[PDB]
């Protein structure tokens, strides 16, 4: 029930370009000089490096982090909006969770009544409910960070708040994610976020450690990749689209090792090649986690505009995405 | 729960790396991953060791850092033949520098390759990292393992080499930097393997101080009494070896390394607790790096590495940008 103050103070100590405002959950790019439109985001703690690792020049101007798996209070979101605001607009990326929407909506409304031009996009890339046939909301999950990177780059290169909103509206729909848990989140006192047999996996997972939508027997990593790819295919229908070019994220949910992640990416890259697709950009790592959960999510995004690859390849000062051309 | 094979080079993991990063090329069936941007214009540095420690050392291959890394099966160093292949490939007659961690198996393979390389006329030189202070902290007559502090050698020697350093100057820098590096780690949980086996047995209320990187039990089992007391223990032991109260130069480099399954929230919170203690101790940490820097499969654990900023130039070297995926930060 506490903002992870020590973690945020430790981030501030580690990175000269980042400053933490004590007791607010707000971490900001202290090099940001209000010359370009700021993009901000935030959410519960426990998904690191989402979103603290995405604060920096060319990505988020600030991120607002709440307690473990609980989004930040609207007053802190509002504080962050006012701080980065200079009368050019503020863009907010929100993950599609009822709790997050409540807090961000309240802050966005208040900010607007104060004269700040705030626009937003809600990330909703998770395909679990379609893949497994549920009537629930489409969660914003690892593919959210594509908005951070693409909108952040476009903003840094001078895009207006209007242009950024239009880009977000074009990008957001293209992003599709499905993940699976290999093991639940472990809490203190030998408790876990759900029960999962050792020979079982849980497909269709989000990020706050809730059980996924479909439990299946574990039949090896290859079979797991096949399932994820099969479900993504069913939503994307890439075989019917002339554009065969995709962006891919391979996301570890916390305690899946790097060797597992790169092995799994090899598998998935081969599967997509055998689907006749070209993956034009790949990022692999713990990109958006759920404490110490073991699992993996795959995100695919059509390269709808070749420029998007330019935006993905632009250097940033954000610690979890320093990669570039 | 699907770790690299114990009897084979992790070919899929390495090819997946190659597919991910345009600047990295994997040479199939050899374990050699190289910086494909490297032009032979500067002295190359290479390293290697078992798989299972990623991002060590595949994440440190890139412009400004390692020119190649040679990776073996899980927890088993690469065969001398593949190390020799890597040396020959990066060599252009200006020397080749090799960073080797102090483990008997690693020394055997690297020594064999270096010896054969030299008989072929290549000026290969090496440093062996031995930063683990576990045996002194806990009073054992065992080897001084090379552990997470090794990456300071990759970064500083790599930068110095990139800036034009000769093989002889690189060796001298290595001899200056290596003994400044002090590391101690603790496991909060052992490596978990298939079929419900662990790398060792650790009660839930216990931690294991003085760990290395291949999942063996630490030198000293203690009851867990909270993260702060863990930092106090590590810093107490490091202090006893470093004796910084006696040094005029209070400037340090710090690494806070997660051993695999320790979360980033835990790592940065721990970094903060440690930084506050080193502050109370009168130290100025002038560079810090936090993350999974050298792991042991899915072990939960942290190691702290301290290194005097003996030469202020070292901060410049630490801050130069590289092409290595696990160390892209710069000033």
From Swiss-Prot, chain A:
Gene Ontology MF annotations: glycerone kinase activity
Transmembrane segments annotated in the record for this chain: none
Xref: Gene3D superfamilies: Dihydroxyacetone kinase, domain 1 (3.40.50.10440), Dihydroxyacetone kinase, domain 2 (3.30.1180.20)
SUPFAM superfamilies per the UniProt record, alphabetical: DAK1/DegV-like (SSF82549)
Positions bearing Tele-(1,2,3-trihydroxypropan-2-yl)histidine: 208
Stretch forming the signal peptide: none
Presence of keyword Transcription: yes
Keyword Nucleus: no
Any one Gene Ontology BP term: glycerol catabolic process
Keywords, comma-separated and alphabetical: Transcription, Transcription regulation
Assembly and oligomerization: Homodimer. Interacts with a homodimer of DhaS.
Function: Coactivator for the transcription factor DhaS. The heterotetramer formed by DhaQ and DhaS functions as a transcriptional regulator. Activated by covalent binding of dihydroxyacetone to DhaQ. The complex activates the dhaKLM operon.
Protein name: DhaKLM operon coactivator DhaQ
Taxonomic lineage: Bacteria, Bacillati, Bacillota, Bacilli, Lactobacillales
């Amino acid at each position: 029930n506490e903002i992870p103050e020590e973690m945020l103070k430790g981030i501030d100590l580690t990175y000269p370009q980042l400053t933490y405002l004590p007791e607010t959950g707000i971490l900001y790019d202290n090099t940001y000089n209000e010359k370009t439109v700021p993009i901000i985001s935030g959410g519960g703690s426990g998904h690191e490096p989402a979103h603290v690792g995405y604060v920096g020049s060319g990505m988020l101007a600030a991120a607002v982090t709440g307690p473990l798996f609980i989004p930040p209070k609207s007053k802190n979101i509002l504080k962050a909006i006012r701080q980065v605001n200079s009368g050019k607009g503020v863009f907010v990326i929100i993950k599609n969770f009822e709790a997050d929407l409540k807090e961000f909506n309240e802050a966005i409304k208040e900010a607007r009544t104060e004269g700040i031009d705030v626009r937003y996009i809600v990330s909703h890339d998770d395909i679990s409910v379609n893949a497994y046939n549920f009537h629930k909301r489409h969660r914003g999950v690892a593919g959210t960070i594509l908005l951070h990177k693409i909108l952040g780059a476009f903003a840094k290169e001078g895009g207006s708040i209007d242009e950024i909103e239009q880009l977000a509206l074009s990008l957001s729909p293209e992003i599709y994610t499905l993940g699976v848990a290999l093991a639940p989140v472990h809490f203190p006192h030998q408790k876990t976020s759900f029960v999962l047999a050792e020979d079982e996996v849980s497909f269709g997972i989000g990020i706050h450690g809730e059980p996924g939508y479909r439990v299946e027997k574990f039949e090896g990593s290859e079979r797991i990749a096949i399932e994820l790819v099969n479900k993504l295919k069913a939503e994307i229908n890439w075989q019917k689209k002339a554009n065969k070019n995709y962006i891919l994220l391979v996301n570890g949910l916390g305690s899946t090792t790097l060797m597992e992640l790169y092995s799994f990416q090899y598998d998935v890259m081969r599967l997509l090649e055998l689907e006749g697709l070209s993956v034009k950009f790949c990022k692999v790592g713990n990109l958006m986690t759920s404490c110490d959960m073991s699992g993996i999510s795959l995100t695919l995004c059509s390269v709808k505009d070749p420029k998007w690859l330019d935006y993905l390849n632009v250097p940033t000062g954000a610690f979890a995405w320093l990669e570039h051309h």
